[PDB]
Design a protein around this ligand. Structure first.
Ligand SMILES: Nc1ncnc2c1ncn2[C@@H]1O[C@H](COP(=O)(O)OP(=O)(O)OP(=O)(O)O)[C@@H](O)[C@H]1O
Ligand SMILES: Nc1ncnc2c1ncn2[C@@H]1O[C@H](COP(=O)(O)OP(=O)(O)OP(=O)(O)O)[C@@H](O)[C@H]1O
Ligand SMILES: Nc1ncnc2c1ncn2[C@@H]1O[C@H](COP(=O)(O)OP(=O)(O)OP(=O)(O)O)[C@@H](O)[C@H]1O
Ligand SMILES: Nc1ncnc2c1ncn2[C@@H]1O[C@H](COP(=O)(O)OP(=O)(O)OP(=O)(O)O)[C@@H](O)[C@H]1O
Ligand SMILES: [Mg+2]
Ligand SMILES: [Mg+2]
Ligand SMILES: [Mg+2]
Ligand SMILES: [Mg+2]
Lengths: 264, 264, 264, 264
DNA sequence: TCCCTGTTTCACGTGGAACACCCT
DNA sequence: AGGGTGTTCCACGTGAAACAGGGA
């Protein structure tokens, strides 16, 4: 078995990584492929996006990382049979400090998620890592474990400057800890295609990275997640979009994305 | 003269800390008050919004915090004569580790920005601090220096959970490092007033904090930053809203906010 | 006992006079008051709305008006024991010529229904008259017999000229043949409260005649017949609504109107 | 030219005779065919639907009928260059009386409009006569003058029985005054296709007249004018649909009606 | 059989954004 | 260009109507 580990990371906040991670885990699970979703955000927004109470959460990914628990100990099962969740909690914040301690003694600790996943990388088809809004210790784990990264891009101004910096970190890890690391693609999120700022910022990213933009290679048209209030309602009902409204366009786009991920 | 030091912070990403910080700084500056805007985010989105190139930026608040530099050295003057900026860069990220080097050694380092600011706090009326989307060391400095905090709320689902944690952290620092700290107000931003998820999240937040909401005290009415494409186009021109589009509603909103802050 | 003789008239077609007449008669009959419903329309829409067969009906109000029959001869008893019907047929169309013959012969004939009615006017509590869509002879009789008039209003454009014109003709008779005639009230019908044309036409009519709009005198709110497919399904079963579907909103409306008419 | 005369008549009120007449005149005028539209209704709602004043109308179809005027004297020009209007006014009511005087002397007067129209039957391609909600003298004139009749049917209950009666009158004229008379078709109006009452009355009327239903010769499919609030606003701006909102479904439908009429 | 609640589909109103005139 | 004007597109909310188990 070969888990593809796809890290949904992007250091910018509010750009759709928790909406993308949760909902791709879902929309790929319905393709009857076994999905594990890691919640690497100390806010634990993905955990709650699937209906859990972080407050009624005993053991989570932190204790796996430091070795106090096996990752197979913490996995929870979700309302979707094919989607299982490694939940998160505020305790994951501690990991920041933890990380630098290894940085002081043996320059490891980028690869803690790498080791924590090693024991289930054959039990799942896809392991999707929802990353927190930083380029800090946690995000670096997320990338180091990963086969590829999915980059949610909200076509507003700062996502210009932001992206290159992120890619910079990628290359750095591509020369340092994770050689295999590929960009699985760029994913426009919250898309409003008729705004002019969006036309411009998309055009810029096209210029530097059109080859990285997700196309449903079935019809080749670009796959962009539409701004959908329904997409932002779905976690409130402890549900993906698939279980909350399978016919809304948020869902259509995230299933199209899953199709594209699958076609190769 | 004694600057009110006001941190626009919130640990959730994309919620308007940077947009509110830039545009409150500007909308107060035109009111003929001398403002310093600190960019406490390694993303340097506030710097970038005022038209600078982070990449053609020499020394920043990082070198201030490590003592290599004076806070008064790094200040740049902006296209508004009354608004000054302390810029940022990824080097500020390094502070993460620097902070914990204090936590291991003498359990301070909460109050670093407080001390570096000490030398410019009488040279300004308001010091407006744009925070990063975390509860880590940087936001801890950002809050601890501050007299009061402005909490921009994106009225969607997670604004529920997050907010409670944020205030608790506020309460925590009030009982440890900054006892004088006040909540200046909550700030609904990107407001689509007719959406149902918004009505709901506003209702919950009203029940728990209705009095802490920015009111146009002339009419008592709520002050809410409307979703406005122009509010998000303006930094692509390195301009605040009032220099980019003074008549749009994003702008009118921020000047009502600024007026409210001045009235007390 | 002195039956109030209430004419539901309006010169525009399809505005609910036949639906209002049937359903007010029924909603008052359920209040244990004895009601006679005159079908003054050669279409005999009120007749068939109560389940009779215009074709298997022998003698009708025509032969009453020409004296060939007593008004007490043509009355049929209906599916409601307290509701009686003077039925109609196409032969009532003949009366047009006949009217002008009286116009030619003794300058009466507006008051023919009045005369034909004299023999049943104390035998009923309310005598409810479904008028045809004109200001011609039949409607002139119908107003001339009547104590008061109920004007069903379809809140579209032509209700504007139309309304004031109907009121005009009312005043004419009030100064000539039937001065006692009172406007029992105005009744918005088929009411869709959110359409903009309705808002506009209602606002116009309000400015000119708000005091005439039927109010739930219990709660003072307006009485408006909601658009109810069932209100239009009921006559196909030869039934009023309260015999058809008493919990529907059309039904509650007509009963609220009935309460209002009795309430004073 | 040989003017086709199409009388839009049906005795039930509020079934679309006037919205249909006005709008077919318009949708036919735009095929660059010369249209003369008679307002044969004393309410003259067709006149007022074309932006004219009953208040500003000097000579109208009444004075033509009594011979005091030429039809060519009263014709007006409309905002559409290929559509001209013979307007109406409440004085047309007088014609009722007029008709019976001839019934008393030489049993003519069905053929008054026929005679008045005699002078423009080569100057127009189509002359469209909007009838009042009666089977009275005017409606009979309109049918007698006309080559064919267009019958708007609102698929509710009373338009079941009503239809049979109307056809009877056709046959009467077809046997007495007007042998050429054709039913150009039945035209479903205010159509709500998913209501069950509408399905049913359609099914019934299909049963009896399935061959009389207007087919868009393009798809063979039935042409049924949808409930369109915009179709009902159009007279408030003195305009047809095609000048007021040419892309709404009201307009497309009245245009399809125009094409079907044109093919023959 | 009488009822009661979850879903669909559809028109219409609303308010934002782009765009094209248009003043002048 | 700057500073109105209205026209076109789209998402979302609403509320009515047909329908469908589900219910003993
Ligand atoms: N395509 C979309 N349309 C509408 N709303 C969306 C869309 N994608 C995401 N959202 C909403 O945007 C808000 C934040 O997005 P989300 O948390 O998924 O991004 P994030 O980067 O994970 O945030 P953070 O970095 O703070 O964890 C939520 O309300 C989310 O539901
Ligand atoms: N009132 C508003 N209307 C429309 N767009 C807005 C508004 N406020 C902010 N935005 C936009 O939303 C995007 C994210 O917002 P912004 O970066 O101001 O929030 P933030 O707090 O800076 O994010 P971070 O949390 O990472 O600092 C930006 O393109 C910004 O222009
Ligand atoms: N409030 C309502 N909701 C729904 N349908 C209605 C309503 N009121 C009337 N209708 C329907 O509209 C159609 C015509 O209304 P109705 O015939 O009662 O008015 P009318 O004055 O009788 O017409 P006429 O002017 O020819 O006598 C009927 O099938 C009727 O059932
Ligand atoms: N397709 C439609 N959708 C919505 N409203 C409509 C439609 N057609 C007509 N109406 C409106 O319903 C009302 C009456 O229709 P209209 O007067 O054309 O029928 P009518 O037969 O002319 O009435 P009359 O029998 O008194 O002549 C008007 O306000 C009319 O514009
Ligand atoms: Mg998240
Ligand atoms: Mg920021
Ligand atoms: Mg009637
Ligand atoms: Mg008419």
């Amino acid at each position: 078995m070969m888990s593809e580990i796809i890290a949904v990371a992007n250091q910018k906040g509010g750009v759709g990584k928790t909406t993308t991670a949760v909902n791709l885990a879902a929309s790929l699970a319905v393709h009857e492929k076994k999905i594990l979703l890691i919640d690497f955000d100390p806010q634990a927004n993905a955990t709650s996006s699937l209906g859990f109470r972080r407050d009624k959460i005993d053991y989570d990914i932190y204790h796996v990382l430091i070795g106090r628990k096996q990752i197979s100990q913490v996995i929870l099962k979700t309302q979707m049979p094919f989607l299982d969740l490694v939940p998160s909690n505020l305790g994951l914040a501690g990991f920041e400090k933890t990380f630098y301690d290894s940085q002081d003694e043996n320059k490891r600790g980028e690869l803690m998620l790498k080791n924590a996943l090693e024991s289930v990388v054959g039990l799942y088809d896809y392991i999707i890592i929802d990353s927190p809004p930083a380029l800090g210790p946690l995000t670096i784990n997320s990338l180091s474990a990963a086969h590829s990264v999915i980059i949610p891009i909200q076509c507003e101004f700062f996502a210009l400057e932001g992206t290159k910096l992120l890619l910079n970190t990628i290359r750095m890890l591509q020369k340092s800890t994770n050689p295999k690391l590929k960009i699985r693609g760029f994913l426009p999120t919250m898309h409003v295609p008729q705004l002019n700022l969006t036309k411009g910022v998309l055009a810029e990213l096209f210029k530097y990275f059109d080859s990285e933009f997700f196309r449903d290679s079935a019809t080749g048209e670009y796959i962009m997640i539409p701004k959908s209030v329904k997409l932002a309602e779905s976690p409130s009902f402890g549900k993906p979009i698939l279980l909350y409204d399978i016919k809304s366009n948020g869902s259509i786009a995230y299933q199209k994305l899953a199709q594209s991920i699958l076609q190769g």
